Every structure is written in C-alpha cells, then in structure tokens.
Design a protein around this ligand. Structure first.
Ligand SMILES: [Cl-]
Ligand SMILES: [Cl-]
Ligand code: NA
Ligand code: NA
Lengths: 129, 129
C-alpha cells in the first residue's frame, strides 16, 4: 500500500507513536517518507547481505527473520514479510522496540540526515487525525 | 465486519463524527451498538417493505437505493450495499446528511430510546483514539 501523508499520520497516532519516547508524530511521518516514500512494500538490499523492509525500512540484521541473513538476530520476533503488510501494526510495534534501544530515532539514517533538527510539524500540518 | 467498541470509536473520530453537529463521539458509538451490535453487515426488513443497512441501520425508504423499495428516495446517492462494507466511510457520510436533516440523532429510534439522556461518555471510556 502507498499511503497518503495525512492518512499515515492518522494511523501512526492510532497506534500510539504520537510522542512515543518524546518523538512527536511529524518525526515518524518524515522518517517513513524518506525511507519508503510511504510504501509498505518497499525493500532495499544492504551491502552486508541484509534487507530492509516496509514503510520504516526495518533491517533483517537485527530485527526480523527473512531466513537469508546469515548469523542475524530476530529481536522483534517476526518474519520480515509481516512488515510489508498494508496494516502497519507490526512495523509500528517493532519500531517501538528499536526506538527504545538506546539510540532513539538515530537508528534510521534518513531520519538522522533529513528530519532531525527540521520543522517536522510541517509533515502533519493540514491533517485531521 | 464486527467492530470492537474502542476500534469503532477511533474510526468514527477519524471520519469526523466527533462533535459533528454537537453530537459527542459516545453518542455515535452508543447508536451503532444498539442498531447493529457493531456489525457492518446487519440488515433488518421494515414492515413497510424498506430495509435498514449496516452499522447505523440506514433506511432504504429515504437514503439509499436497493432497487426494491417501491417509490423511495436515494438522498445519499448510494447503493444500500455500500453501507455493508467493512469500511465505514459511506455509512458515516450518509449519517452526516441524515443528522443535518433537522431532527438530529432522533432519526435513529434506538438512539432516542436508549442513548439519549444517558452518560454516553461511558461508551468511549478506556479507548485510545
Ligand atoms: Cl531519544
Ligand atoms: Cl440537534
Ligand atoms: Na534476522
Ligand atoms: Na430508496
């Protein structure tokens, strides 16, 4: 599924990402935009052989099982294929674990490089939630 | 689809029923409960030959076209079958027209008899939206 901007913001709020660990909603919308372009079916292969999956491009090295990432962990206890669903629930719940890892939203490179320090409220401006 | 209580409240809010024409969210959840028991696929045949459809039991006499209600109107410009969808959008938008008809939520008998004058906030108590 390709989400519209305001539709994604609404769903993220529903699932409790609004101010989760102090990260305002616009931070999450901004991340998704630059990671996946709002596409739940995005995948990107990493040089190390790992794969990132879904709307927040969650990495198979640590977080999900794709059965083809030699010597990896499965810290969110899920198949990577669940993170490609139209339903963002599993992506969200895995994201909550990641952001609670100690490094916060710096675990998403695109968030660190393109969202951090900007005016993220612009990402939810003009949306009914 | 059979909705859970808190899930329905969230979706109604998303679609802008919260305080629509001054009707708080709990009023809408209460209505749906007693009309349909949270079931989008509910139908009930009226003595006059008309049929009520969906989560808010919207009547074919005035509001939708089912092709079998002799001499009826289609004021929401929709097939009645659209009001049975898992997606509540069409029910909601037709509901907004009805409640703007002049009689408010008195157009739902079960709302008038079971919700009106009660403490409707109890219907959304314990829900994250
Ligand atoms: Cl942090
Ligand atoms: Cl009124
Ligand atoms: Na893995
Ligand atoms: Na009709």
């Amino acid at each position: 599924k390709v989400f519209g901007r305001c539709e994604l913001a609404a769903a993220m709020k529903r699932h409790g990402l609004d101010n989760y660990r102090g990260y305002s909603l616009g931070n999450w919308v901004c991340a998704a935009k630059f990671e996946s372009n709002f596409n739940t079916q995005a995948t990107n292969r990493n040089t190390d052989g790992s794969t990132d999956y879904g709307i927040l491009q969650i990495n198979s090295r640590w977080w999900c099982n794709d059965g083809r990432t030699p010597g990896s962990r499965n810290l969110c206890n899920i198949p990577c294929s669940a993170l490609l669903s139209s339903d963002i629930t599993a992506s969200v719940n895995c994201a909550k674990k990641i952001v609670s890892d100690g490094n916060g939203m710096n675990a998403w490179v695109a968030w660190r490089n393109r969202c951090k320090g900007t005016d993220v409220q612009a990402w939810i401006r003009g949306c009914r939630l």
